Ligand binder design. Structure first.
Ligand SMILES: [Ca+2]
Ligand SMILES: [Zn+2]
Length: 392
């Protein structure tokens, strides 16, 4: 039945928060409950990571590592010099100090979470040649995360991840539209955007950039400030990594480890129009996605960028064609699931009829058994064999 005892770790996208944030409301579960809890009750040790939702995958990856092993976030000296932010972040206690002693984990990531998870794997296993070269060139200390040689991750599961980016950013008004997604998760959780709460509520963890919501500042007001900040204007952001070109770049160095299993899940909440060839939002898609983005994703074409008709289908925020695994600028192989979970290859699990937010329970969908979906997932992860024997 079960082949391993690795704990499961949860990871979010451009939206996300800690278990104690959003007054109880969990990113993993939302209006449908508590995912991390359900899995623990069913006997699968499960934890949750909270990283900078608008930060680049690199920053998140450094935060994920430190949050898992414990310590102060070290973004890398060369990295910090190149982007002009702090080298050191926040300090963590360490969710799983067992990792530094031979332990392994299973990473279930959603949205942009999937790129982060890939990146963390590639850094753990290979480190950063540039970071290593800069350490000795300028005699600065070096994070273990940049030496290579770690083997913490048994598997990586991706759900609605923009492996090849999303064409949602190509919107002319993407800046304003995008912060409406943060406003939306705030409403999902019953939190207003026009109110200066004195309690944090939603920490964007921008310690490296020196940004934070201040006194008598409503999320709306704070979002206006962010838009003009490096978090939204520099390449070292989630906005860059989310774009087609940015993903392509990330795809060029972030490869699938041969020692790690990879699982892909794709989402889709659309229908094809017979005369236009466009995709249109289905009944039950969240109102923010259905009004502005869903129509853009299913009609947006760009020949020079490589955007044709296979990119139309979407989950209201991310193109479905970009979820089965990195393709643009990648050497990673993808194989359709045939009952056998191979290692070092993207095991394409197919497309599911749920939106970007229905998969995590942030948006409701009673036609979707979210409990069964994540219980099936973990049962599958526990059955993964650490070392598989070659056979007939
Ligand atoms: Ca819905
Ligand atoms: Zn950075």
């Amino acid at each position: 039945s079960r082949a391993n005892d690795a704990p499961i770790v949860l990871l979010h996208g451009f939206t996300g928060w800690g278990r104690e944030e959003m007054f109880g409301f969990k990113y993993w579960g939302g209006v449908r409950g508590d995912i991390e809890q359900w899995l623990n009750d069913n006997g699968y040790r499960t934890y949750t990571l909270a990283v900078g939702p608008l930060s680049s995958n690199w920053d998140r990856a450094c935060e994920a590592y430190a949050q898992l092993v414990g310590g102060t976030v070290d973004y890398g000296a060369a990295h910090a010099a190149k982007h002009g932010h702090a080298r050191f972040g926040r300090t963590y206690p360490g969710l799983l100090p067992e990792l530094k002693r031979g332990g392994r984990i299973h990473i279930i990531a959603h949205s942009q979470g999937g790129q982060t998870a890939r990146m963390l794997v590639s850094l753990l296993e290979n480190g950063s040649q540039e970071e290593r070269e800069y350490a000795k060139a300028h005699n600065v200390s070096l994070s273990p995360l940049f030496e290579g040689g770690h083997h913490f991750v048994l598997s990586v599961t991706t759900i609605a991840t923009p492996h090849d980016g999303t064409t949602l950013v190509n919107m002319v008004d993407f800046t304003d539209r995008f912060f409406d997604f943060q406003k939306a998760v705030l409403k999902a959780a019953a939190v207003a955007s026009n109110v200066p709460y004195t309690s944090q509520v939603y920490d964007f963890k921008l310690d490296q950039w020196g940004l934070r919501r201040q006194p008598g500042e409503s999320f709306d007001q704070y979002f206006e400030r962010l838009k003009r900040s490096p978090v939204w204007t520099s390449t070292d952001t989630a906005r860059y990594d989310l774009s087609v070109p940015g993903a392509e770049k990330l795809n060029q160095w972030v490869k699938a480890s041969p020692n790690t299993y990879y699982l892909s899940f794709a989402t889709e909440r659309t229908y094809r129009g017979a005369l236009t060839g466009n995709y249109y939002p289905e009944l039950g898609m969240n109102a923010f996605s259905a009004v502005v983005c869903a129509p853009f994703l299913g009609s947006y074409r760009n020949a020079t960028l490589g955007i044709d008709d296979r990119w139309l289908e979407n989950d209201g925020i991310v193109n479905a064609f970009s979820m089965n695994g990195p393709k643009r600028g990648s050497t990673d192989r993808i194989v359709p699931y045939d009952g056998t979970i191979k290692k070092g290859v993207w095991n394409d699990m197919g497309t599911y009829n749920v939106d970007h937010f229905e998969v995590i329970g942030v948006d409701p969908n009673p036609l979707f058994d979210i409990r069964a979906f994540y219980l099936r997932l973990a049962e599958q992860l526990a059955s993964l064999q650490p070392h598989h024997h070659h056979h007939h």
